[PDB]
Paper text:
PL kinase is one of the key enzymes involved in PLP metabolism. The ATP binds in a shallow cavity at the active site, while the vitamin B6 substrate binds in a solvent-inaccessible deeper cavity opposite but facing the γ-phosphate of the ATP.
Occupying the same position as the theophylline is a 2-methyl-2,4-pentanediol (MPD) molecule at 40% occupancy. Possible contacts between the active site residues and theophylline involve a hydrogen-bond interaction between the hydroxyl group of Ser12 and the N9 of the theophylline imidazole nitrogen, which is also present between Ser12 and the pyridine nitrogen atom of PM in the sheep PL kinase structure. In the theophylline complex, the C6 oxygen of the piperazine ring and the N7 of the imidazole ring are adjacent to Thr47, but any possible hydrogen-bond interactions are considerably lengthened beyond 3.6 Å. In the sheep structure, Asp235 makes a strong hydrogen-bond interaction with the C5′-OH group of PM. In addition the C2 oxygen atom is involved in water-mediated interactions with the side-chains of Asp235, Gln11 or main-chain nitrogen of Tyr84. A bound Na+ in the hPL kinase-theophylline structure is located at the ATP binding site, and is coordinated by five well-defined water molecules. The intricate water-mediated interaction between the Na+ and the protein is believed to stabilize the active site conformation. Detailed kinetic studies with ginkgotoxin, theophylline, lamotrigine and enprofylline showed the compounds to inhibit hPL kinase with a Ki of 3, 50, 56 and 228 µM, repectively.
Residue numbers in the entry:
A (entry chain B): 4 to 279, 282 to 312
B (entry chain A): 4 to 207, 214 to 312
Amino acid sequence: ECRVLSIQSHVIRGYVGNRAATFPLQVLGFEIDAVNSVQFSNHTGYAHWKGQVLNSDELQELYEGLRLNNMNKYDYVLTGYTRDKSFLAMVVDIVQELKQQNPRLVYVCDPVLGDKWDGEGSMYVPEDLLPVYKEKVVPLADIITPNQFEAELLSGRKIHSQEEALRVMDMLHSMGPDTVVITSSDLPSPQGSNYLIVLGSQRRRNPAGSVVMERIRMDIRKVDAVFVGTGDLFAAMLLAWTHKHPNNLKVACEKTVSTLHHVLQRTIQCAKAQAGVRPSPMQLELRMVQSKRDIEDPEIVVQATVL
Amino acid sequence: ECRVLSIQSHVIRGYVGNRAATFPLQVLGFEIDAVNSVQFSNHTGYAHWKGQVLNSDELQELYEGLRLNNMNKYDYVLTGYTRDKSFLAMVVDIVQELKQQNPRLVYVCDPVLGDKWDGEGSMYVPEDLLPVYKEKVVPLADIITPNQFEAELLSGRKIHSQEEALRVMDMLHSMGPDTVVITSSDLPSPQGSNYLIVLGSQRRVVMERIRMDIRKVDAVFVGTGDLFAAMLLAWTHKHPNNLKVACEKTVSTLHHVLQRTIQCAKAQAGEGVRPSPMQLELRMVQSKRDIEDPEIVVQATVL
Ligand SMILES: Cn1c(=O)c2[nH]cnc2n(C)c1=O
Ligand SMILES: Cn1c(=O)c2[nH]cnc2n(C)c1=O
Ligand code: NA
Ligand code: NA
């Protein structure tokens, strides 16, 4: 089996965090264990929400149970939105130990920090997490999925073009991860302003022992709606597809993105049908269960360009 | 869509409570929402375990979030192992309101209280819960899945035979639930000493009673009851007026999961060697196909 330790948020209603990542990965045959970092009624995008949060001591306690039972052996660790520094610090110590047990362990990290909605975006998490991500998390990460804003904060350099983005990706590689994917863009696109850019870069040592790097690009059609959990789903699927195609970033990224496409298209349709009228957050909840078939064998609806 | 609110335990490693009921129900297309009554590193059958418990106040606030957003509309509610009196009490108040919100809501309840090994009965929860189950839970439930021991405790009458079991089930029906299934019993089967009898009764007035003779296994699995209730919910949903088929698919599904689980357990633990709780964890993920369309391997007989 292939074991994944996913430490993310949980909601009763809806799909974000572990709710967005668990079903798909289970459907794909992964033994995914879910540590819920928070338990809320629904995501914070709704008008109302209530719930509890897990603290760093409780996380450590849970890991103790696993350790005591000699069940602290994983192939992958997967994290995303993290709200607290001591929690993030604990996540770091846990990954560090799991990597000692298994040096081949792959840590997939979605470095959630914030986004843009003008020019100079804003953060979604305490600023004191940035230094921890820079000095502790990223260095341990093997695969990261920052958006442009996050790539800039992590690298400490702004991005105004594709070449600058690639330079940032090289900087991020030097910080630690062999696979870097700047998930969202807003860089010029030959197809217009209705498209966003996805850039991916993967460094690996081939059979002959040569260290090479593969770079790809995708121009994805934007959507006129605010979805939640897509980044969590993107990271989970990237994990799954790079696992299946370890030396082919292109195919891995094309399947990840296509899976997202099918889920979002189905979600958009159902959302509209449930009215007209801008759908509510509830109606825009990802149609995960209904996308089982697309998750298993996604029809490739987009092709990446080689860089 | 068919929404299900499942209030059960959560474990990081393994499959029990919500871990045993969610994946299968999702695979089957249900929009199941999971309220984790606890979050443990693994079930209590291991040498060690750590975790936290959700208290009744936390359950209420989580529900408040749903209510405030008008997301308190469910087609089903699913509960199982509960340990606190106050938590269970909070659970009935919620089902109470959810039923007020949706009169057609079906409440599937697995009355976890205890079980009888050799002959004597052992309790799994504080006895201060029995009164709550009898007086408030069961009366609210529409489908219950007690083993023989639990049925005896709920009805207050002992069972020594099949017809006494059916009379107890008639008693449980009068208490409220239209569907009653005795998932496990000490009753004898002509199939041999290695089989146990399962009895089901559904009211809809017409009554449908069925019987299944199931093979036993010299191994202790955790989460099977949780999975049984989830699947019974799923299949009774697909076949609402046919307890016979709903139970054959439910039991057939468990068979495939346990069969696969036992084989992998022995493969990991050499022949002759008794598998550990870790090796005995249900092989849920690998049973996706069996959950979607279970090959029928057991026939129920209409009584
Ligand atoms: C996007 N998103 C959310 O909106 C959210 N809300 C609560 N947890 C959450 N998590 C983990 C998340 O990733
Ligand atoms: C059988 N069983 C257990 O033994 C257990 N232990 C902790 N949660 C548990 N749940 C939800 C359960 O169903
Ligand atoms: Na992101
Ligand atoms: Na039981």
